[PDB]
Copies of this chain bind each other. A is one copy, B any other.
Amino acid sequence: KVPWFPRKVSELDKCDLDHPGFSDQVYRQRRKLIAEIAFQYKHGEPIPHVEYTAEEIATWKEVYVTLKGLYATHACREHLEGFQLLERYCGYREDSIPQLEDVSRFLKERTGFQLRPVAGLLSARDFLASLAFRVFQCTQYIRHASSPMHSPEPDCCHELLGHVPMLADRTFAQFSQDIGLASLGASDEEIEKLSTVYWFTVEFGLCKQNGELKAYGAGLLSSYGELLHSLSEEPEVRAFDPDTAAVQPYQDQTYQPVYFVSESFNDAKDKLRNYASRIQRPFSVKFDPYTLAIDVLDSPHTIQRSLEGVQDELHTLAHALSAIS
């Protein structure tokens, strides 16, 4: 009736001909070796390092330097600041691919997010379920060296340059987890809608900052050509509205003809939660950050229990107010 959903972060352990390397056997083996890490991974273990070969490091260096050249003019400020933090503390550079375990430690200390190696495109419900615990299911393999500027699937370049930097921002990290919180136990229809909102924000969203249009969608930030086109006069840009985006069809191959612009991440977050209010449901969930668990609020008592945590917090703020006078 209500599909199953994880309630503890532990439980996430239960959750082509045209491809540039389809006819490379050395590459198809590198992959199986890398997917291997995702398949044997359990919550709580340090993510195993991958020793990238010089050519892999070379594909990274091209994607990196090229996109790096567009960020100052095309990216939202959250991306620039997070990309700068990654360079300062997580060894981001053009001559070496970062290790997931070092990036995860960096995200845990900045916004509480963490990474989990994944074998390649997860089911929509499992992906959003993971976002609910501030866990980003992340690929560890690189795109075939023959087409560095273009990748069908999400590779580590797309993950580490496209997603990770925005996850270092407090407000965006909360927006992402909110989409995942909203999806827990939701119907398949509601999962597809949420996946679509996700597509038009986390993946291909645009935002307005000091009158200028800027990208924040990972699919834009890890794509040289799409990045230039998203800010051009060619696609149509609509005001972000969770309801409108949820039913906007879209496709995978070519650039997007339509994008949604949010006014601010706090505005989009507010619009996403009023949207989540209207989702048909006999309960609500609230994340418990101390234990990485999902509390189900389905009675006056469970709501009262969380309220108590909130009243303790307000007590702390009252004390801070006398302390500073």
Residue ranges of A at the interface with B (Cβ–Cβ < 8 Å):
8, 10, 44, 105, 108-112, 134, 174, 270, 273, 276-277, 281-284, 286, 289-293, 297-304, 306-325
Q: Of the candidates B282, B306, B322, B325, which one forms a contact with A317 in the assembled complex, judged by CB atoms under 8 Å apart?
A: B306
Q: Of the candidates B286, B291, B306, B323, which one forms a contact with A110 in the assembled complex, judged by CB atoms under 8 Å apart?
A: B291
CA of A283 to CA of B321, assembled, Å: 8
- A266 CB to nearest B CB, Å: 9
Q: Assess whether B310 is in contact with A310, with CB atoms less than 8 Å apart.
A: yes
Q: Assess whether A284 is in contact with B325, with CB atoms less than 8 Å apart.
A: no
Chain B residues with CB below 8 A from A298, complex form: 320, 323-324
CA of A322 to CA of B304, assembled, Å: 7
Q: Assess whether A320 is in contact with B297, with CB atoms less than 8 Å apart.
A: yes
Q: With A111-B291, A300-B321 given, name 19 new contacts (CB 8 A).
A: A8-B109, A174-B312, A282-B324, A284-B319, A284-B323, A289-B289, A297-B317, A297-B320, A297-B324, A302-B320, A303-B317, A303-B320, A303-B321, A304-B318, A304-B322, A310-B313, A310-B314, A311-B311, A311-B315
Q: Could you jot down 22 A-B contacts, CB within 8 Å? A: A44-B105, A108-B291, A109-B292, A112-B289, A112-B290, A112-B291, A270-B270, A281-B323, A283-B320, A283-B324, A284-B320, A286-B313, A289-B289, A298-B323, A299-B324, A300-B300, A300-B325, A301-B325, A304-B318, A311-B314, A313-B313, A314-B314
Chain B residues with CB below 8 A from A282, complex form: 323-324
Chain B residues with CB below 8 A from A299, complex form: 324-325
Q: Assess whether A318 is in contact with B311, with CB atoms less than 8 Å apart.
A: yes
CA of A272 to CA of B301, assembled, Å: 22
Q: Which of A108, A321, A325 has the most CB of B within 10 A?
A: A321
Chain B residues with CB below 8 A from A321, complex form: 300-301, 303-304, 307
Q: Write the chain B residue with the least CB distance to A314.
A: B311
Q: Assess whether B300 is in contact with A324, with CB atoms less than 8 Å apart.
A: yes
Chain B residues with CB below 8 A from A108, complex form: 291-292
Chain B residues with CB below 8 A from A319, complex form: 273, 276-277, 284
Q: Assess whether B310 is in contact with A323, with CB atoms less than 8 Å apart.
A: no
Q: Write the chain B residue with the least CB distance to A264.
A: B274
CA of A134 to CA of B292, assembled, Å: 14
CA of A112 to CA of B293, assembled, Å: 10
Q: Which of A44, A109, A111, A323 has the most CB of B within 10 A?
A: A323
Chain B residues with CB below 8 A from A292, complex form: 108-109
- A96 CB to nearest B CB, Å: 22
Q: Assess whether A286 is in contact with B112, with CB atoms less than 8 Å apart.
A: no
Chain B residues with CB below 8 A from A134, complex form: 290
Known: A300-B321, A324-B298, A325-B299. A316 touches B105 (CB 8 A): no
